[PDB]
Assembly symmetry: C3
Homo-oligomer: 596 residues x 3
Amino acid sequence: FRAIIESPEGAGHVGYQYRRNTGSTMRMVSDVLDERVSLWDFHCDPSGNVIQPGPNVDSRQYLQAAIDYVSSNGGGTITIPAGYTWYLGSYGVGGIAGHSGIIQLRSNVNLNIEGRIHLSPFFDLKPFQVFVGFDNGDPASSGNLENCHIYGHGVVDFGGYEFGASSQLRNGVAFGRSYNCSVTGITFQNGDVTWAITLGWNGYGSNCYVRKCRFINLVNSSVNADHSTVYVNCPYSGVESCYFSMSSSFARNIACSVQLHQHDTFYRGSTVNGYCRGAYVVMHAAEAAGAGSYAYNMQVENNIAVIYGQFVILGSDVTATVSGHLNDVIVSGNIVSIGERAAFSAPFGAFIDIGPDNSGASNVQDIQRVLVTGNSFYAPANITDSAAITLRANLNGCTFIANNFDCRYMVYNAPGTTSPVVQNLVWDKSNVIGGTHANQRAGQNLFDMQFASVVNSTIEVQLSCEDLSMFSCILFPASCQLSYSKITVDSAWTKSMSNTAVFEGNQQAGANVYVSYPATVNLTSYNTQGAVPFFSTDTNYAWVTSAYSLSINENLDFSPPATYTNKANGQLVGVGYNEIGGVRSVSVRLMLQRQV
Amino acid sequence: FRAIIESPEGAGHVGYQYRRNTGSTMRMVSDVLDERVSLWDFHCDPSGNVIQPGPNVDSRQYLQAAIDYVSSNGGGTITIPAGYTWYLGSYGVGGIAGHSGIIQLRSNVNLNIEGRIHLSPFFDLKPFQVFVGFDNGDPASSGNLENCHIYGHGVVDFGGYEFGASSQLRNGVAFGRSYNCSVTGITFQNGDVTWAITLGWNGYGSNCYVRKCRFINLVNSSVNADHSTVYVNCPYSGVESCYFSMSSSFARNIACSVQLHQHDTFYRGSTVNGYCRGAYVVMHAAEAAGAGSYAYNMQVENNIAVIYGQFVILGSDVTATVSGHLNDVIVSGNIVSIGERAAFSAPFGAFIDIGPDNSGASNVQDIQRVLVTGNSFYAPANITDSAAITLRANLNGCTFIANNFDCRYMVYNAPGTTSPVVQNLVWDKSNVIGGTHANQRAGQNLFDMQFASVVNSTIEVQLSCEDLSMFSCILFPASCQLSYSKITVDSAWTKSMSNTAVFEGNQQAGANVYVSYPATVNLTSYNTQGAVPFFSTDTNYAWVTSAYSLSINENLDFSPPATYTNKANGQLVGVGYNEIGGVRSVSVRLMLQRQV
Amino acid sequence: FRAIIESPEGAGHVGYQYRRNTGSTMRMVSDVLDERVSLWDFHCDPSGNVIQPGPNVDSRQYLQAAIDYVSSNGGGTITIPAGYTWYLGSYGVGGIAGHSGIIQLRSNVNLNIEGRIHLSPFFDLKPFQVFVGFDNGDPASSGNLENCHIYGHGVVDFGGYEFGASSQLRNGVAFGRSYNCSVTGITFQNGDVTWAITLGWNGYGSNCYVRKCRFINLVNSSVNADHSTVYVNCPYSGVESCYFSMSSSFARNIACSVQLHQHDTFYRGSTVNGYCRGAYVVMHAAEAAGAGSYAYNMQVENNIAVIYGQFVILGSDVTATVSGHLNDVIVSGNIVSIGERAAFSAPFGAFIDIGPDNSGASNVQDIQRVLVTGNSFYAPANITDSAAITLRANLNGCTFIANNFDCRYMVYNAPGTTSPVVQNLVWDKSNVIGGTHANQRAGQNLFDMQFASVVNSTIEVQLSCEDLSMFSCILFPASCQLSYSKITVDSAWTKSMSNTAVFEGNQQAGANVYVSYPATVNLTSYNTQGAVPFFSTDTNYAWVTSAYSLSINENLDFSPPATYTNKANGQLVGVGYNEIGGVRSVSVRLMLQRQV
Ligand SMILES: CC(=O)N[C@@H]1[C@H]2O[C@]3(O[C@H]4[C@H](O)[C@@H](CO[C@@]5(OC[C@@H](O[C@H]1O)[C@H]2O)O[C@H](CO)[C@@H](O)[C@H](O)[C@H]5O)O[C@H](O)[C@@H]4NC(C)=O)O[C@H](CO)[C@H](O[C@H]1O[C@H](CO[C@@H]2O[C@@H](C)[C@H](O)[C@@H](O)[C@H]2O)[C@@H](O)[C@H](O)[C@H]1O)[C@H](O[C@@H]1O[C@H](CO)[C@@H](O)[C@H](O)[C@H]1NC(C)=O)[C@H]3O
Ligand SMILES: CC(=O)N[C@@H]1[C@H]2O[C@]3(O[C@H]4[C@H](O)[C@@H](CO[C@@]5(OC[C@@H](O[C@H]1O)[C@H]2O)O[C@H](CO)[C@@H](O)[C@H](O)[C@H]5O)O[C@H](O)[C@@H]4NC(C)=O)O[C@H](CO)[C@H](O[C@H]1O[C@H](CO[C@@H]2O[C@@H](C)[C@H](O)[C@@H](O)[C@H]2O)[C@@H](O)[C@H](O)[C@H]1O)[C@H](O[C@@H]1O[C@H](CO)[C@@H](O)[C@H](O)[C@H]1NC(C)=O)[C@H]3O
Ligand code: NA
Ligand code: NA
Ligand code: NA
Ligand code: NA
Ligand code: NA
Ligand code: NA
Ligand code: NA
Ligand code: NA
Ligand code: NA
């Protein structure tokens, strides 16, 4: 009996019944212990003696054996024990080798990481993906990963190692073709990686989530080509209540927190500091296989960010046989700033960027039905390169309502670069334009409409303080066609501006252009006593449907007209009043109106 | 000794002290095992031998025995083990039998569902409620359920069985008169049910929540009368970060994701696909016993939905002795579309519906202080039956600010049906009206004001592109009284519209109606050289307080007035200028204004 | 052998191998039991015999021994078992004694509270902090607490004891200088305390969170000086999805739910009932040591509240050597009401308060770049003391867009109290002003601008129903300077108001003041037949740049001007038309405009 009890089957001979309940199962101790499983149950030598983890022990084969075994019983949760650091020091074998994989995840096998998982110096200057849910080196030939959850209070530490070559890839968790998989509570830290977590593969997958995770210092070298902390490449998936922080200079130029690349995906309630970019919201044609060629129902909400480049980047593109489309997007409730930096020292600061494709093409995009509402954006006064929207590629629609934008430009695109075709750009009057950059705008147009064309668009400019340094509130170069559009500049804070709206090709004269803006106009009257006409000296008002006075009348003996219409020769005309006769000459501030 | 050790009391004779710590308790192994409990501890035959679960084993009595026992010790958490499917194959007995109950929940007894719970074919064509927290067949005589949490990565599978009769009810979890109860992480799938989860009973309960659950394919037949996935019938309760999906045709006509039926309830951060409706926000008088007759502090925020009918339905109603009231509601940050379907093939598409009671009555409602803000709504161009709001019952107030609505109608109610009494409907100018349905609106009014009366309301219409197909921007039939209201149509994109605002009963003449809209007006002048009057040929402008030109003047020799007032006979009059004399005749586009 | 097996080392001699897997570790039963730990492992007498908890057992030393031991092994999670109430009945010793501490938390040692922790009557009329993460009585000399998480379905019950003296402090969890610490799922109840949870210390700490907790009845006496349920005093931290309830009268006068006192902090998705205040958003100079002197990236979103005082209070202040600054704040998506109460029976009702410092100073604040958007606020009609914003201290900027405010005042400050200096106050026209207080406003100004000065501000007043009881829509006393500002009153619902905008110092005449509002004006014409001038009888319009008719013309034989300008003597003048000659005299409602 002593032999049996001291043997590995001993617990299988000690009887147990829950709480001495006579109605409970008559079990053995081993049965109850078998209800849970930990890395300790596989972390042993060939004789079955436990091995202590440590920097000189490679725990990989043992964790893999645990996963393989639990998988074979239909699943369960393997605990990675608290109070220990478990080092990984070799590559996995088989289907994950094509992904530089360390551990292969399996369906229905959850990992409760309570301790620490650390990469050993074997991985220095090498590629790696720590956990991989693909089962084949070719993702198109891979099976699915289902019902795999990684959670706990533990840590994945990437060892601080730099990339060896820019062409290498590194990742924390690649769920693969992933259905009902998640990471919750985990801290990913101290690395130079491409991604921390990737969900899905080219639209294959569903219901994958990253929640309450921390991502700290995951870019550290000039070799790192690019970094996006979470890449969401399956629909009905997203990122919620996470924390993302970088301290490296390199991160300010290369790092983004999230990629939302399939329909019905979201990024909410998260805090970002030290990154270049917040989130891309994109449909890549090359990623359209599993869920279609449309990214729709895309949500970026209630995030807090300090970034150095752009908050949300919108795009779509094409391959030889597939066209990507982006539509039905909402960006709301976010509070975002460009961190302290010199002008032009990081990628151009923006709340929204309409980004050209990876080859720089600006004529492949199909982006529409986007609502940007209830956000606040701030950039310090010295940051010349800061805009509410950098509109750098073709845009089929974007709507701004009730935001507060406090930066250098509202709408911007650089002259002599791309010439976007713009449709359905709507900037509602409820967007509040801050004053941080007042007096910084010499030579600059607040809305700098450097486009090929603008149609079906609305720009309602409302200032909230004076900035007499700017060249204009809104400027259209002669190369920009403008039609079926409404462009207004409210008069408040504009009395002393030389230029308010500027149409360098006289585009405001278009049949279906609806415009109003302030201007200074010189008038002269006829001599007649009584009701008497006043006429503008200049003849550039053939497009004006009505105008009205924004100036007081300092005179007693006469008054100019309150309101004006035009004449065929381009003069304004109105009827004033001469109490006493005489030719009058006045300079008046008018609101010029066309069809409004 | 061998006898004792091999007996069910054996573990109670093997000593243990935590980590050989001399300061720790000297325990027995059974004491430590007794800290946890699983279904295995009760899933046994009358001799105490464990029984394997499977499709031919009814696990119900064993799970019930586990719950009953743990309850008797003041509570705890019972694990339903991973790697097994536990089938239920009979009805429960006692107080839950009146609810077609399977398992009776008890207070302080949590269920950690890691494996799968599946209904056996016993339940085919039958009613059932899988988990029931009532302790009496009459809910009014039931005790409370407190501190009961169901959570884990597991699954409740309803076996795919159709309803046997439309009058049957099916549910997953009915917490009952439930205080501090929740479901977290669970997947409910593969059924034809009435509800997945119900919280509370007629206002009795508090602090009940559904979080991070999935609801997949829970309607599958034409027999199913109605489906709402979660019914929230207790205050201080709600649904967060859930996923709801249906694939059946029937679901598009009958299924809603959530009912919010008591005060201080919420629905946030969730994704819905394949349903008829998003959420009802309702006070039923028949449900007012536990928490009063007011549903207030109701929140529907930051959800993503593809539906076929209406997103949010508002209502309240009465019984013989109780009147229900709905107020203090916020609907914000949601992105919603009507999915691809033929016009009129599902219930009328809407973002907000003001829904008549279950008997069709439209004169029992008391709905006010609702804020709908920062949402986006889209319906494909062919969907005639799509509206920002279908206003089908009496409304005491609803406020729309800063939404983007891209569908056929803005405000709609069908003529020849109900005649709501409308008060305090506010449609702010910051609502952006999309252009998807441009050119589809022959014979249709964008705001079709088919009401008995409208008072204290604001409609500020702002187009963002042309749609010359529509009959009018806004139309009031002669049967609709209109008073103490502001109705404006911005001129942008309206120059070529025959009708902008239409008042078929000349209601715009009311003493406290404030209106402005564009119109085309024919004028003739007197012969006089110099300042000269122009008068309208028609006499239907007795209500106009001022008008101004929206047209250019192609003439050199004269100009019509910039601005006009009226005369007692209903003509417009203004003072223009004849450089040379002559009777003039012009047709001008004017902004007509009344009291604005 | 029997001796060994019955001894505390017995489990260390019974062999086990997971699921009889020949590839698994050959362990002993004690090894597997050692993977978990509970209070039972330390809750024993000096001979190692287990002690049952209860109201006459002080569990403190045992829980402390458990924490101290697990800490020494590098951490883990200690379960506090379900089905038992564990009483605490003495103070801790050492570093926590200076904090009236009971239990000392240690790094990496989590507490899974499943049962109940209750304070014994030892603590009646005494100070206490139940769990303390400081390790020194002087916080400036304390070490850090890291990686400490408290979670579960359990309860902390404060025994209902009143404070003994107002100067005492009581707390539930003081994490201290806390990095990666959290409380999740716990119910804190039945107390008279200062705080339930405090995060951080004077800016030291990071990544601390309170999620899914309940706070119920934590103020019960007149002795309690002040209460804030969660104080967030470290950056990158916040409160999400919590429930806060009070029933005591005292709570309505003293209690706030949250303090956000460091940068990158948030309060979201929570429900509050019975409190005085929602949240303070503040930078105290005295708290600036660990994270700097700026509170920025502050977020209060998507909360539901019934309160009696103010929802969000903004402030910053100074010490002898440090100045605090508050900027980059967003308050969005909240639905808030003042609960039923008599006027003036609790602190002044407000959605936003700009609060003077703790000494009452209103000239130390530096608050700017605040966005308040998409919120709804309601106060019952009798509550005179209710305002969208009580602006009681110096303000450098606050922006309101797309809110719905239904209360007595929009902007308020009490006359004869503080005289704030106001800059960059922006009230967009998209704010909807409710009608609950219509007819209650005798003697009152809707926007009561009781300030020293206002600059760079925008107030666009838009009514949505009539209230002829109010004295004015907006009033500036003569003591308030006004410059570089835009003040407009839309005409809708204003026709019968005697006063719309009132400038008691004629401030609207300022060179850079842009204003428009309705007024009634008496005019007389000259006798001349034909085009004929009309002039105002009064001479107080020297500041008017244009005016236009808001009245119809009941006359046939003449018409007054549609539009007017002014003259040097302060008369309005315009050109009307006398079909037949005669001196005319009319009273007209005009929109008066200055520079707009
Ligand atoms: C499936 C569902 O919940 N449908 C919703 C309707 O519920 C009733 O619920 C329907 C609601 O009335 C409407 C609200 O819109 C209408 O909109 C609300 C209706 O929406 C359906 O989605 C609900 O009434 O009214 C609005 C206000 O006037 C108006 O604006 C709008 O335009 C209208 O359309 O929304 C849904 O459609 C609701 N439907 C569902 C499926 O939730 O109809 C239900 C049909 O299933 C259900 O009635 C049945 O069940 C009750 C309850 O069953 C008894 O009690 C329980 C406790 C025991 O366990 C059972 O064994 C049984 O004894 C039966 O009495 C009734 O005869 C059945 O037809 C809804 O009942 C409520 O169910 C909840 C959840 O279980 C209970 O907590 C609550 O006590 C029940 N309320 C009442 C009054 O009985 C019923 O409200
Ligand atoms: C109960 C509470 O937190 N009240 C809030 C006030 O806190 C002080 O906190 C109050 C805040 O000052 C005000 C802010 O609004 C006012 O608004 C802020 C005040 O709001 C109360 O709600 C807080 O100061 O100032 C604004 C800015 O100028 C202005 O806009 C506004 O109009 C003003 O009204 O908000 C609340 O009212 C705060 N009150 C509460 C209860 O949080 O007052 C507190 C009273 O309890 C408290 O002071 C006491 O406690 C400190 C701390 O105790 C020592 O240190 C700790 C670490 C040890 O454990 C203890 O044993 C003890 O040695 C005592 O020094 C002091 O003498 C007591 O009166 C607040 O102190 C801060 O407590 C937090 C949380 O524990 C600490 O992390 C922090 O270090 C403390 N800060 C300071 C400067 O001591 C105090 O700020
Ligand atoms: Na590869
Ligand atoms: Na890139
Ligand atoms: Na990137
Ligand atoms: Na029943
Ligand atoms: Na129904
Ligand atoms: Na329904
Ligand atoms: Na102290
Ligand atoms: Na205080
Ligand atoms: Na307080």
